Structure 1
């Protein structure tokens, strides 16, 4: 059972995202279900260590946003081309 803490994004787009990644966080998004897609950011190193284990991709995780829990599955992950980093992540509401 993996736990991920996240804040919603006050901004969006290219600039926002590159600043985000240079601050050592990275964008992600949660969609699926009845609700509206929720844009979030994550702490890079936490997620980077968590996704090293197979379970991460096969299992239901919990994302804590504003104290509220959402159960998700990892759908699609974009990785930086030559570096050991993550560009971005899709979580579908489980």
Structure 2
């Protein structure tokens, strides 16, 4: 059910990541397996609404980048200190 439609990050770090969260997108990362890590930027409110549900952090999830449907599990999530926002997600493959 959870199908996150993601794009690939062209620039990384603090300036680039803040530039994203000012534009209602947030950074994330996919790791696991032996494939290299994949840095993705997600649309905030889309992911925000979906992680409200309980079966986002327990079921297999799928992320589409460049057309390729990559299956993952949610692994770690950086929340805003004092808002109902999201800074960063770690997705592990599975």
Give the total of aligned pairs: 94
Q: Specify the alignment match of 2:29 in structure 1.
A: 29
RMSD of equivalent CA atoms: 0.4
Equivalence for 2:39: 39
Shift of 1:86: 0.3
Structure 1: gaps (5+ residues): none
SS at match of 1:18: helix
Kindly report structure 1 stretches of 4+ aligned residues shifted beyond 6 Å: none
Structure 2: 5+ residue stretches without partners: none
SS in 2 for 1:34: coil
Encode CA deviations 1:6-48: one digit per residue, 9 max, x unaligned. Answer: 1100000000000000011000000000100000000000000
CA displacement at 1:79 relative to structure 2: 0.1
TM-score by length of 2: 0.99
